[PDB]
Amino acid sequence: MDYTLMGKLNDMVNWGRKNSIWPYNFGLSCCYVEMVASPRQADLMVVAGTCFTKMAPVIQRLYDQMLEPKWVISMGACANSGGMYDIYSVVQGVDKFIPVDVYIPGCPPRPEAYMQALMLLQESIGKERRPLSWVVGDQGVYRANMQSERERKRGERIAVTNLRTPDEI
Amino acid sequence: EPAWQTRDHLDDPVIGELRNRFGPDAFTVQATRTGVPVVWIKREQLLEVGDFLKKLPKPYVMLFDLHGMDERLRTHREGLPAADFSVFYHLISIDRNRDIMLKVALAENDLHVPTFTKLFPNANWYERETWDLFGITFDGHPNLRRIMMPQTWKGHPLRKDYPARATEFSPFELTKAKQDLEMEALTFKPEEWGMKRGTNEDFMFLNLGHGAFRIVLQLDGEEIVDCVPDIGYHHRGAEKMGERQSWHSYIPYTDRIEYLGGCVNEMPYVLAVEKLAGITVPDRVNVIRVMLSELFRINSHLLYISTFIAFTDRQKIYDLVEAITGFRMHPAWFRIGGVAHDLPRGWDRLLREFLDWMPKRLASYEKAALQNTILKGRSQGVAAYGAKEALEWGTTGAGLRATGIDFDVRKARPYSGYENFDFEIPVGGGVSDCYTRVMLKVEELRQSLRILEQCLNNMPEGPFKADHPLTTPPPKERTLQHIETLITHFLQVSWGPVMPANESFQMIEATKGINSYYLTSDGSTMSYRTRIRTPSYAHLQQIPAAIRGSLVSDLIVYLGSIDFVMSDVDR
């Protein structure tokens, strides 16, 4: 499989990083109170809310305080793209200024959607290659171009025929 | 004579009193559907009229609202004075159980009004926001700075020539804003905030980190001498979106203001749109709306009490609301003229299972609240204010009733058939501390369960949407079968329903106080002006005047005791 810019220990390191993930939950807006550690110790940043223009610098600074390796999960349509607030005071997506590894649609997403995002991030971490040391070898991060989730789940989604009618609970 | 009929309220005694005091030619009475006497005052008589209303035999004691309107694009301005901008002042008399709206007309070249901070101190933040969003100066204001936008903001976003949509992002301006946020503590100037005596030299200035916002603190050791809360970090431009969505498609945005509220925030918007539309909704709509608003009020109160001191009760409410509307947090389910669907088959089983399982939890909550001596030592007596302080700062909801002032919207000014439900309004002593507010919220939880029992027990049979032609959208089976209904649905979901030109107003008792929607229609399919008064704004402005001489931990407890969210503050 393709990647984007002696071997078993790399899988060991990936397994250690994958099973041990410490989040920093950014409050921001109502995606946070749906879904419910200093940034120095946390390695995953969960942006859950509208990226307002007055606190885009706060998000950028608290992202810059984290240490490599670092991953970003964007919950909610606001953090994905701006959502419904295509308005003057709202940044249209947190991926305008920080790199995002997993996106979850929803307004808000369910907590189980965040669990699914955690599983997706865990697979992404497990299938990537990072430098072991900063003195030996290539000092480049190899992200894997994984198969998209909407094309992976296309067969069972298209195969759906009948649903329950909305007149009952 | 329906409730939504356009009236001028010339039979109001305030109009006769103002005429006998200032003369008949001093003001212009406007006919609205706000339910309020709207009078247009000269700018030079404005402080005189405010002082006269403050000293009536049953005086107008509370400034409910103060904001601006851009009247330049308003075409249907018949019977109105010539204005390029206007400032409106909503004043509430509780003894009279009335309210009045004063309006001051302003030309484009002379945008300045005398300030009301000598009459009503909440006009401080109201006038700062009116300056920030419309560009109107208020002469005599102590510190007229921006409150929603950053101080280095170009233009006033609520003006009609300001584009609503998001401009191009720039890392350039982003790194400037980051570098001024890094150097803010080094270059803190304590008169760009309204502070004084900045470094005495024993005084220390800090910044503190229900939403995320900053509050600048001035300390004598550990005692708070002055504080200013920095808000606007959660500003979404919801009122501007009101000017850029159709009447129907603005409903989700009404949900996302005060996000713990859901249908409680949905309610005053559709009530004001139905006042604009001349719609009277049937009783089944009234009971469905009351039931959903009380379910969400119970959810919000449980979250507030759990935060102040759980997950199962709110989960049961969320499953019931998810079964009715299809969504937990932002149902988007109230409609103009009714509700989006009928109740699902099995709603009563879920509500009966929720109501048969709740009273023992309520007894547990009362045990954990009124028998907790650690909480009863930590909470009462701190950040306490009386009735006079709550009236002058626009405090509504649990704080106002905890001061002994028996004012609830659901009883004084009933809406959506709340007079058909038997429920009590808890009022406390004369002291509004953390403890009395928490027990008032517990008693309101009990009363909301009573209202839910009455919603379940005698639920009307009938339509869930009105027979009115302006009901948006029309019933879906007639839309899918009948051509005139298909036509009405077509033009109501595409161009939008046409509300004839009028001004409407609805205030309701939200989960955190009084929430009101003031809607101005220019005869089009969008709102000309959407003014949203939220209680968390007025409650946050009272924070400096309530903890003068307290400690920082006392400030933290006060912040916990106030039911507020930043989306409600900033909208």
Add this chain to the structure above:
Amino acid sequence: ATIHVDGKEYEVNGADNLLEACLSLGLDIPYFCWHPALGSVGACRQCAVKQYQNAEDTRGRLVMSCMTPASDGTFISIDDEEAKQFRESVVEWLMTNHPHDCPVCEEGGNCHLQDMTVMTGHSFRRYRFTKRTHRNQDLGPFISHEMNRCIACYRCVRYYKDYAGGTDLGVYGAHDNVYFGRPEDGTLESEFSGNLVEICPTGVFTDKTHSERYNRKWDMQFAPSICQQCSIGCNISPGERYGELRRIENRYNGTVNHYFLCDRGRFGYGYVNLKDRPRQPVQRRGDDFITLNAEQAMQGAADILRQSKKVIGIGSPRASVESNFALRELVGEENFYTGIAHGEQERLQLALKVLREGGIYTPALREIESYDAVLVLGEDVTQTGARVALAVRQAVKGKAREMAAAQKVADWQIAAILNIGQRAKHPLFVTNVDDTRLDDIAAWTYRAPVEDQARLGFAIAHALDNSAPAVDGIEPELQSKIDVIVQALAGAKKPLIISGTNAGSLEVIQAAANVAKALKGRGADVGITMIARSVNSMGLGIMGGGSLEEALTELETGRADAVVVLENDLHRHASATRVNAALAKAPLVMVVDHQRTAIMENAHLVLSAASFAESDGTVINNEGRAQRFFQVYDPAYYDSKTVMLESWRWLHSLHSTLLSREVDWTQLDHVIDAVVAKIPELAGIKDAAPDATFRIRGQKLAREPHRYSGRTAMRANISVHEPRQPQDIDTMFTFSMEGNNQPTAHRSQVPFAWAPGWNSPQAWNKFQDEVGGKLRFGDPGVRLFETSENGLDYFTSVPARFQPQDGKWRIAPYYHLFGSDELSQRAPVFQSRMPQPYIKLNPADAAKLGVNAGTRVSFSYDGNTVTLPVEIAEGLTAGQVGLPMGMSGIAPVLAGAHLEDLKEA
């Protein structure tokens, strides 16, 4: 007059009906069968108000506001409960048979019936029985027919028959089975059949060309533009979606084209959407075609222009004033050549001299409908200036209007007027080389060669005024008909003389000027109209320059070694062999064009210019009216690599890169200021539209409706990140709905009509001062010149009569509305409507040739032998041979040329 509507006093015109008076006051009354241009009939019964006898009358009576005069002391109630009930009932009765078709109906969101159903307040069906249904007809490539949606309001037949004069649309049947259509399947024959898609208040008649690529009205990006398909300059609203031009709606102009277009301007927009258009600058290097961006194309072109000795510029009457001026500045005034031939230019400048020096006032297109007698000399008006033909038809019906006004019958009561004036009509005298489409209402038609038409004009002028030069050899029967024309023209209060450059004769224009001068000498209120050939023919004539023949001479002699061709294919104004040889001799050919023309194979650089949809500019009417057209959309919004700039932008940056070696993408108002500074006779174009700093209370004018959809998904397949909204530095319009389109805004350029509650083309009533009048703050456009104080002299160059000489064949020009224009005949929907290439012959000439109808003859013109099949034309004269101008292989410059070796293939 004084009326009282619901107790409110209003001052109105007493000569109007109550429906138009109340619509002019902003009051909303539902209506179907009334049109401002068609008058009142009282069919649909929708416009009911309640009339009272006086102020102290309570019971009233329901009257029909379109059939009730707005007299003094009138008392009506619109919001009476009985009137409201009856209007809802009328909507209900229409709804009983209406199909459940709105999602699959092209009228949806633009439907007057949808608007009036919503306005009356009818949304509940209590009808349980069956609906009547109808079979549909095939009405040709442009109009789609769906008779189920009809509400039997008779607007289509009233327009198509009483107004447009067409004969193949009617109403058939009876009680509730009335059917509106053709007597059989086939193409609608009228040149103004396209206006049925806006006359019909339902989805019965719809734009088939738009139905191919349908999008709803709220999804369009609209701009106010000028139609480019002939010289009349009708105001249009082109609307786009997803980067392609989707529809041409009519844009109301109370001075030019009020409610109506012609079929060419309405349906020949499809050349904009062609996939072979230049979208990027391309440089020829050997046999390779290297694609460049704007900067390096300008650098390479500027280097090649700087190393050359003389650079000539060949403009076009297609291009705007700004583009032609930019080319004139780039190459120099003495090096600038108009791209038209010498004879075409001579006829054009004579038409301009008659217009702006002859001392006779040239009417606007709307004002043509008030003239009492019409003489058309040489110009096939229906095929070259069709809206002038429609206005001529209205002026002809003016006689019935006067007769009905004599009997105190109101002007809106169209059935009474048409009954009183049965077949009486104002005198119309047309001349052509054959039959025209105005012969049904012409008092006389003269089929003759252009020399004999000019001689008839000179003889009419001599009989009106003896100081005009006399014509010898007039036959006694032709002299009797000339005396008939003279008696009709002399007795008219307002005569109108129409001619143009399409007849291919200088002497026809001279004769028309002579007739107009003779009528002006008798004190008559005479007007003269000249039909130019292209959209900016009079602008290119006012600018001036050498002919195309001079430019080809410069290229062939080697005096010019670099040629810049602007929006010109060069084959419609000169022979293709000569053009090809001259362009092959040049070491630099640079073609700035928006259509893939045939001269791009020899071109060394091709600049992808913008068409009228992708550009701004100014064009000059056939009556000398300067009109701005604004850009509809950004071509680079969807395809990021598209470099398709305005022609004047390309040429101004090329001039700047030639002078100071830096690119300069200027602004439109800078180019307009340069035009009005350097050319004082074009100084009126500054006031054609306001500058880019014009605001309505601080905001720009919106190009798209306020309910525009798909903002965050229309480009998501290219990139999920939303691009920046396109910036329009050139005009006062914004490429978004963040702007103003209020009907009460103080402007004259309205991109599209929409009001809350009026989503149809009936929304134009809100944007007008009175309905059927002008726009509320005046029509857009400005006349360049006024009527001169002093006239011309009589032209004394009277031609001799046509002599049919053996071996030669005089080429008589036949024009077709679908085919003669260049860009519109490139549009793919026109090939179905295009006539087959047929060469017209007299029966005597064809019998002499041994050739019957349909067999193919071969003739050689300019060393090129081509073969066409023969159609017999009885109306032609012997010694003439008929050719369709502007088609494939037949340049319009052949009009008046001779033919050799016409023999059967």
Add this chain to the structure above:
Amino acid sequence: EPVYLPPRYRGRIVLTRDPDGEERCVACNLCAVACPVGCISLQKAETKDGRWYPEFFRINFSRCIFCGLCEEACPTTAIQLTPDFEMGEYKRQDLVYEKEDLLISGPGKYPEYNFYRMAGMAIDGKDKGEAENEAKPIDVKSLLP
């Protein structure tokens, strides 16, 4: 354990089919204009028999707030919000769902409705007068008065 979602739950959006097996969408664009976010984009095409269908159909799910206004506005019940919430993606470009990612093989939550059985427009298999509550077309040349 699997999560329980009620039938009204507003989750992943699909385009459904009629009982005959053809796609219900007539490309009327009412969903796109009723979307307050503007994250629906489609284009009308027509079959040889005159049936309106979407040439393409795309939804920006990174923008979509799952409000259900499109389903409420659909007059054919083609577009529906289904009880499914597992839509997390690695790339935001993969959150733009084309017609191949939205068109399921059944009627979804409305098992029987067919808009083209009620419309008067003639398509293949439904001539004039063959729809619901519709009389046969009376020819204008009929002998009956």
